[PDB]
User: Fold adp-ribosylation factor binding protein GGA1 from Homo sapiens.
Amino acid sequence: NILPVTVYDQHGFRILFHFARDPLPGRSDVLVVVVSMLSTAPQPIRNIVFQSAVPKVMKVKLQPPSGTELPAFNPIVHPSAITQVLLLANPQKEKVRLRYKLTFTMGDQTYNEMGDVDQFPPPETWGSL
Assistant:
């Protein structure tokens, strides 16, 4: 039903938002956004900065990411992954718009971008995810 949304997908570097609720019967006014960052790129990804902002009428509750760099993908070995968990507290149940900032270095370049994610599940579904 509710699928991961792709926030970034280039060069083999993928940042996805996975939606969930706490697996124990909890409140349908908080969204668990699990951010996965997986690289299958042939070069290391370093100095990864992924920041998020959301409207004042809901609290962000960002926690630190599991890491900041990803090694070059090689078919022999395990692809590494960064996880980061956001708890999106939206009791007024307004439309969720997230502003993100992405910065990283790969090869001989530094990549910077910022944008809006607007594909959050309807607040009504928070409890049945």
Observations:
- The chain has one domain: 1-129.
